[PDB]
Amino acid sequence: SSVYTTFMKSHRCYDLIPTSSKLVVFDTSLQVKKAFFALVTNGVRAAPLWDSKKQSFVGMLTITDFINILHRYYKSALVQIYELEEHKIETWREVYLQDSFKPLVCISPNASLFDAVSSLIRNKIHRLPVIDPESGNTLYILTHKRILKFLKLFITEFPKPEFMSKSLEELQIGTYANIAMVRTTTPVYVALGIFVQHRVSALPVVDEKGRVVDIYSKFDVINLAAEKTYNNLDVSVTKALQHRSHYFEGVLKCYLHETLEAIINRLVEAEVHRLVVVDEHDVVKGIVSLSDILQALVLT
Amino acid sequence: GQEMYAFRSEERFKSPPILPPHLLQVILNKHVMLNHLYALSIKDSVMVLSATHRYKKKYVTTLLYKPI
Amino acid sequence: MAWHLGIRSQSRPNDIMAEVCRAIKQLDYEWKVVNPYYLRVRRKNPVTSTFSKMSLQLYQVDSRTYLLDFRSIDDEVAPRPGSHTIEFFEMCANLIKNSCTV
Ligand SMILES: CCN(CC)c1ccc2cc(C(=O)N[C@H]3[C@@H](O)[C@H](n4cnc5c(N)ncnc54)O[C@@H]3COP(=O)(O)OP(=O)(O)O)c(=O)oc2c1
Numbered sequence: 001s002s003v004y005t006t007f008m009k010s011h012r013c014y015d016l017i018p019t020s021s022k023l024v025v026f027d028t029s030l031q032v033k034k035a036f037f038a039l040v041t042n043g044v045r046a047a048p049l050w051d052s053k054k055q056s057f058v059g060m061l062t063i064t065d066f067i068n069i070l071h072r073y074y075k076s077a078l079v080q081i082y083e084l085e086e087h088k089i090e091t092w093r094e095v096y097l098q099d100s101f102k103p104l105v106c107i108s109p110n111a112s113l114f115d116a117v118s119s120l121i122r123n124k125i126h127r128l129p130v131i132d133p134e135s136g137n138t139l140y141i142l143t144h145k146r147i148l149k150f151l152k153l154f155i156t157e158f159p160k161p162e163f164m165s166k167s168l169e170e171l172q173i174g175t176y177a178n179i180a181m182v183r184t185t186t187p188v189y190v191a192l193g194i195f196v197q198h199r200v201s202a203l204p205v206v207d208e209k210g211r212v213v214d215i216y217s218k219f220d221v222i223n224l225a226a227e228k229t230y231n232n233l234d235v236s237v238t239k240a241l242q243h244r245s246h247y248f249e250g251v252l253k254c255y256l257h258e259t260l261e262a263i264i265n266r267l268v269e270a271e272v273h274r275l276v277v278v279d280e281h282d283v284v285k286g287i288v289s290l291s292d293i294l295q296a297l298v299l300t
Numbered sequence: 301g302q303e304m305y306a307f308r309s310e311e312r313f314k315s316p317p318i319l320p321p322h323l324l325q326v327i328l329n330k331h332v333m334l335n336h337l338y339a340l341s342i343k344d345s346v347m348v349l350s351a352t353h354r355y356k357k358k359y360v361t362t363l364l365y366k367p368i
Numbered sequence: 369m370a371w372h373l374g375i376r377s378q379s380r381p382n383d384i385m386a387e388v389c390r391a392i393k394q395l396d397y398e399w400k401v402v403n404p405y406y407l408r409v410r411r412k413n414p415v416t417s418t419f420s421k422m423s424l425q426l427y428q429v430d431s432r433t434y435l436l437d438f439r440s441i442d443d444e445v446a447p448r449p450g451s452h453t454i455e456f457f458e459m460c461a462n463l464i465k466n467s468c469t470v
């Protein structure tokens with residue numbers, strides 16, 4: 001128990017929703033190719049899935065879905081199987097588990113922010129629909145990014161716990177072993193395979209000396225839905241990153257010996273999902289993600 | 301007694317009411333329009349329906365993508 | 369993105385009304401005629417057993433063109449079936465599909 005735990009347990013999910021927001025919903029009989037293009041066109045990262053037959057929300061369509069489908073699409077094409085691209089949402093969902101069956105994870109606007117964080121961690125998820133039980137409507141999609149920002153802003157800097165002044169290395173927040181990375185020349189299809197195997201939301205791009213020069217993330221993946229690519233998956237990650245060659249400073253990094261406070265501050269101010277942990281010479285040592293931060297704040 | 305007569309206004313509803321200038325036909329994306337249905341032009345057999353609804357103090361604009 | 373309020377038609381106002389009224393009947397919705405261009409519509413959901421309410425209003429936007437407006441009506445962990453907003457969209461869709469053609 002701390003000033004963070006107290007705050008989270010005494011605030012409702014309702015308090016986090018902006019005055020005005022946009023929500024994209026897909027009927028499950030919609031074509032997959034059309035759904036992912038709708039994500040891009042609407043500037044949105046996820047969409048609740050509506051099953052008309054059941055008159056119910058049954059899941060979410062995210063970039064992780066897109067990664068998995070593209071990976072399967074690429075391998076099937078080399079073996080002359082072409083289905084997915086004319087798959088509807090229900091058929092794609094039927095493919096991947098199907099009893100193995102995963103129900104929709106959601107939360108009430110009146111439930112605590114504590115329960116929201118707990119649900120994200122437990123379910124290994126980044127998108128938590130806030131659903132009003134009276135009307136059944138989805139109001140908002142809650143995220144790590146939004147939650148951390150809220151915490152940073154509405155908690156007074158003081159009554160400050162001792163652990164805020166402690167370094168990442170002291171507190172062991174982040175991942176510092178078996179880091180999923182790609183090289184400058186690594187083809188996109190290989191990168192997708194790495195995404196699927198490690199269930200990770202970003203890949204650092206490194207040179208021959210293991211120094212980070214860029215980052216390949218979920219933002220870069222849905223761009224393949226914008227451009228009518230689907231074909232040129234054999235190109236390098238670098239070529240795929242040309243869509244943002246201009247207007248790009250560099251990768252946001254941190255060091256092992258920075259305080260939790262400084263890193264929370266950097267993550268919030270930058271509006272980014274992770275920092276690449278690096279040494280004196282920009283060699284990748286690990287990743288600290290919003291996932292690690294919120295897991296640390298909820299348990300300590 | 302004498303037969304009685306009927307006076308009917310008739311033309312009060314001969315034409316539908318004109319759209320009041322506060323309700324606008326087109327929104328670019330790119331008040332109280334609350335609860336009103338909006339739509340994109342149908343493209344490639346898909347319809348996009350849209351509306352804005354209030355929950356307490358919050359407004360959400362929902363878009364439904366739905367095949368014909 | 370250009371968003372359009374309801375749907376537009378150049379068909380006769382009385383023919384628009386008669387046709388939405390027939391479509392309502394064919395769909396098993398309840399309705400009330402508030403005035404000749406204003407209808408309240410009520411539906412029992414086949415799956416959920418809950419009720420959905422909306423309004424239909426016809427407007428004239430120019431000398432040959434009319435506008436049909438649809439407005440949802442406000443009443444009074446795994447999710448249960450149902451969503452007022454989505455069901456509103458589905459009512460509208462079903463009504464359009466069964467009353468008119470492009
Ligand atoms: C070996 C067979 N196979 C390969 C063909 C499989 C098998 C299983 C899956 C499952 C997926 C999934 O679940 N993705 C997604 C998504 O569909 C689902 N999900 C997200 N939010 C959810 C919620 N609130 N409730 C329920 N589910 C939610 O969880 C997965 C993780 O997404 P995420 O929350 O990390 O979002 P993000 O992608 O980071 O925006 C998926 O993309 O691909 C799969 C492929």
Ligand SMILES: CCN(CC)c1ccc2cc(C(=O)N[C@H]3[C@@H](O)[C@H](n4cnc5c(N)ncnc54)O[C@@H]3COP(=O)(O)OP(=O)(O)O)c(=O)oc2c1
Nearest residue numbers: 201215217218219244247250251252271272273274275276
């Ligand atoms: C009008 C000018 N223009 C047209 C060309 C735009 C318009 C919009 C964007 C949006 C971007 C973005 O949303 N990136 C993404 C991403 O490229 C970047 N980012 C994430 N982690 C980073 C890190 N560790 N270091 C550096 N960057 C990181 O920050 C943005 C937010 O991503 P995210 O943290 O929500 O999750 P994701 O990285 O997508 O899994 C972006 O990069 O470039 C843009 C250019």
Ligand SMILES: Nc1ncnc2c1ncn2[C@@H]1O[C@H](COP(=O)(O)O)[C@@H](O)[C@H]1O
Nearest residue numbers: 174175179180200201202203287289291
């Ligand atoms: N490239 C990566 N390699 C290894 N682990 C990662 C990587 N990116 C994120 N993680 C870890 O995986 C968990 C979820 O990460 P994220 O997908 O960023 O929420 C967190 O513990 C991260 O530190």
